[PDB]
Amino acid sequence: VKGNYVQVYVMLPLDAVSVNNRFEKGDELRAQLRKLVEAGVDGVMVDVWWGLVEGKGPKAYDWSAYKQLFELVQKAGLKLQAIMSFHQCGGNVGDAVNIPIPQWVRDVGTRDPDIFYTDGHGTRNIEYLTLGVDNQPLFHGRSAVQMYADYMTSFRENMKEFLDAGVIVDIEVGLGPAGEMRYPSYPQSHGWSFPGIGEFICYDKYLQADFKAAAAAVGHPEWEFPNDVGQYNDTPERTQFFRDNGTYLSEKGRFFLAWYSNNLIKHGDRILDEANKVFLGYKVQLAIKISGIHWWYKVPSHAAELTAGYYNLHDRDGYRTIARMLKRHRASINFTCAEMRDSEQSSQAMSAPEELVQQVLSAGWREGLNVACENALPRYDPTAYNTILRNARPHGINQSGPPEHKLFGFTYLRLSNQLVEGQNYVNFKTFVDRMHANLPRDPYVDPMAPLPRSGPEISIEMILQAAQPKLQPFPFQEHTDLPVG
């Protein structure tokens, strides 16, 4: 029975550390974490905000608030998943917690605005640095990759006790907006609203130059970005690029989609190589986050996936390519939408979260990766928990041993007083029991080996062999065999 146990993590509040980098929720969190421990929870997850820690200047890392938080987590006996959060929290009207990237990095942007992902109207998104400047030494002598590596190194050095005591077990490497490996193709501040197709965000001058060079290398120096792509809130059939039998299928369209999605894959590969070097020998797993772009999954162009940077079509597996890049690093995939049913979505949105989840999980498993999930939206109800259960163990309980497939972990978004009171808490506690296959909490489940070095670098052409032939997902049971009640 024990091989069936799936760990449950809870995401801490976005301001677990205050926006002024002080640890102010000691009393509240201590009581809330006792409730999580009483409910069987294995660990918690927390954003380690770049804008808080490196806020005062280059290499002026102030870890003091995070240390107090971590001591609290250790004293509660919980495991911890740390997100290297190189992105902005919040920043839209009505957002409760606003934590930009460091001011001194934004200051560089006032002179070089092309450090930001830029759309076709020239709007600069300030939430993350363009993959275009990964290797450009624009930041008081450092490149973006060097800044990420130095931050991670400082983290390792300062949190060494927590790593050595087995408190920190997972490092999630932020690779874009919201920590997700994607482009900022659906920004509420630029006027996107669900279920718009989004936009290609490759207009910064660094990426424009990258494209020109890539185009000339295949004998087409004239070529340019597609301009028949509509705008954020269009539907696919209103554009010549995304409509059925549209120009996404042309030679030019294919080259551009590959260039755009490949750049994201290369961004992840190079940052994970540095992260691996940082954490070499520590008993931690590295993970990336893949966003769940379920809208337009039911139309042939998969338009919203394409603009996010996931080059996924009926005959092209744009998630298995990503999984193949992760293989050498022994990095895990953290996906979302674990809680969603297709029947819960708007019909206009052409949305298939269940099929998307099955595709991403099956891609990870076929590459031998650990796969974990999160819920996309707040849910407290049994149906949601049953949906997660189904995804956690797609073939149900195995009586004999471990199941053929299961999630390595599930992380619940997110902790607050609402979760640890009333019927919510009762539903949640019952969920954790079921995730654990009705066994008591085992803190020593899924032990980590010392992190080995990433295997040999493989080329983009090698990675892309994983795209085709596109395989059907593994079959998933329609309903969990171990429901909450």
Ligand X SMILES: OC[C@H]1O[C@H](O[C@H]2[C@H](F)[C@@H](O)[C@@H](O)O[C@@H]2CO)[C@H](O)[C@@H](O)[C@@H]1O
Query: Which residues are near ligand X by CB under 6 A?
Result: 11, 14, 47, 83, 85, 87, 89, 178-180, 289, 291, 336, 374, 376
Query: What is the 3 state secondary structure string of the chain?
Result: CHHHCCEEEEECCCCCCCCCCCCCCHHHHHHHHHHHHHCCCCEEEEEEEHHHHCCCCCCCCCCHHHHHHHHHHHHHCCEEEEEEECCCECCCCCCCCCECCCHHHHHHHHHCHHHEEECCCCCEEEEEECHHHCCCCCECCECHHHHHHHHHHHHHHHCHHHHHCCCEEEEEECCCHHHECCCCCCCHHHCCCCCCCCCCCCCCHHHHHHHHHHHHHCCCCCCCCCCCCCCCCCCHHHCCCCCCCCHHHCHHHHHHHHHHHHHHHHHHHHHHHHHHHHHCCCCCEEEEECCCCCCCCCCCCCHHHHHHCCCCECCECCCHHHHHHHHCCCCEEEECCCCCCHHHCCCCCCCCHHHHHHHHHHHHHHCCCCEEEECCCCCCCHHHHHHHHHHHCCCCCCCCCCCCCCCCEEEECCCCCCCCCHHHHHHHHHHHHHHCCCCCCCCCCCCCCCCCCCCCCCCHHHHHHHHCCCCCCCCCCCCCCCCCC
Give bridge partners of residue 124 from the DSSP assignment: 118
Residue 259 or 412 with smaller CB distance to ligand X: 412
Rounded to a whole number of angstroms, the minimum distance from the CB of residue 189 to ligand X is: 13
Rounded to a whole number of angstroms, the minimum distance from the CB of residue 139 to ligand X is: 21
Distance (Å, whole) CA 392 – CA 373: 8
Residue 85 or 239 with smaller CB distance to ligand X: 85
Residue 14 or 73 with smaller CB distance to ligand X: 14
Residue 19 or 376 with smaller CB distance to ligand X: 376
Specify whether the CB–CB gap between 338 and 375 falls below 8 A.
yes
Is 27 a known ligand-binding residue? no
Rounded to a whole number of angstroms, the minimum distance from the CB of residue 176 to ligand X is: 10
Rounded to a whole number of angstroms, the minimum distance from the CB of residue 398 to ligand X is: 29
Residue 16 or 323 with smaller CB distance to ligand X: 16
Is 414 a known ligand-binding residue? yes
Is 140 a known ligand-binding residue? no
Is 42 a known ligand-binding residue? no
Residue 289 or 316 with smaller CB distance to ligand X: 289
Active site residues: 180, 374
Is 289 a known ligand-binding residue? yes
Rounded to a whole number of angstroms, the minimum distance from the CB of residue 126 to ligand X is: 14
Is 375 a known ligand-binding residue? yes
Per-residue tokens: 390:
């189904």
Residue 81 or 247 with smaller CB distance to ligand X: 81
Rounded to a whole number of angstroms, the minimum distance from the CB of residue 329 to ligand X is: 20
Per-residue tokens: 170:
């997972």
Is 87 a known ligand-binding residue? yes
Rounded to a whole number of angstroms, the minimum distance from the CB of residue 49 to ligand X is: 8
State the binding site: 47, 87, 95, 289, 294, 336, 375-376, 414
State the binding site for substrate: 47, 87, 95, 289, 294, 336, 375-376, 414
